[PDB]
Amino acid sequence: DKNELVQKAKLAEQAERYDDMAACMKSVTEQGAELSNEERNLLSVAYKNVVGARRSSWRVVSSIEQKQQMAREYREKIETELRDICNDVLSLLEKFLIPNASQAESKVFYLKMKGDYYRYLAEVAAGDDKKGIVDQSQQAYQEAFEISKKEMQPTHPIRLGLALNFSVFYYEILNSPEKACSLAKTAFDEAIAELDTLSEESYKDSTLIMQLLRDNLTLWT
């Protein structure tokens, strides 16, 4: 049954065999049952490394394609794998994760994923296909961003997380430095203020993400 896979995927993770991990966590999800926090994290980490491996390869090839048809074909070979991985996730999202998501925390998280994996497609979207792809990303993010504003404290790690990622979207994909910085400062400056309440530990999860926000801002100015 299912408890075996989660144990089996964690093994793949220590074994740094991320494709097997994604494969297992794919099965735990295709069950139709809403995911456990533990289960979700494991799905997310699995596919982060499977897709991340291709993004790195891609950035590396594409930088060398600039500095020749051989370099291009290899880039396109990479992109096809990238696209598969992304659609695979997006289907699982639309078919299993998002409909089942109950709480706001879950529905935002899966929507931020949706934005994130559409963002990864936008990194390699060429020609005609790009416009359509960018849109489903921003719509995905935006919807999550709105629910988040309704349901979450300025220092909530998921909200802080959505802000960080969705800012990058502006800076990098939309090439809007202003919208992207404007958003990061919004999320960050709210946090510092609310940071009276925080328990030491919460403080840690928050300060961690807030540090990522400022890291980009630093980098962006």
Binding site: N37, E172, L212, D215, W220
Partner: peptide, 18 residues
Amino acid sequence: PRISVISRRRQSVLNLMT
């Protein structure tokens, strides 16, 4: 036996919940 220490881009985050 030395098992001891020696030897640029923008950040994005995945949120891993308790």
